[PDB]
Design a protein around this ligand. Sequence first.
Ligand SMILES: [Ca+2]
Ligand SMILES: [Ca+2]
Length: 76
Amino acid sequence: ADQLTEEQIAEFKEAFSLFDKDGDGTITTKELGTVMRSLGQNPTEAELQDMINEVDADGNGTIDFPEFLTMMARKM
Ligand SMILES: [Ca+2]
Ligand SMILES: [Ca+2]
C-alpha cells in the first residue's frame, strides 16, 4: 500500500462531512463531542482537547479532513 485506498479515504471523507455540521471544513471539540455522544461515548472537554491534540499537527486546535484521516487510521 503506497499511499492509501481511494475507497477507504472516501468512506472516511463522508464520515468527515457528517461530523462537519457547519460545513466549514474544521471539526471542533463541540462537533466531536456531539458525534461521540451519538455513538454512546461521553468524552470530557479535557479528553476532547487531548484527543484532538494527539493528532493536531498544524497547531490549529481542531481536526480537519487529512487530520481526521490520520486519527481514524490510528483507531485500527
Ligand atoms: Ca465543522
Ligand atoms: Ca489540527
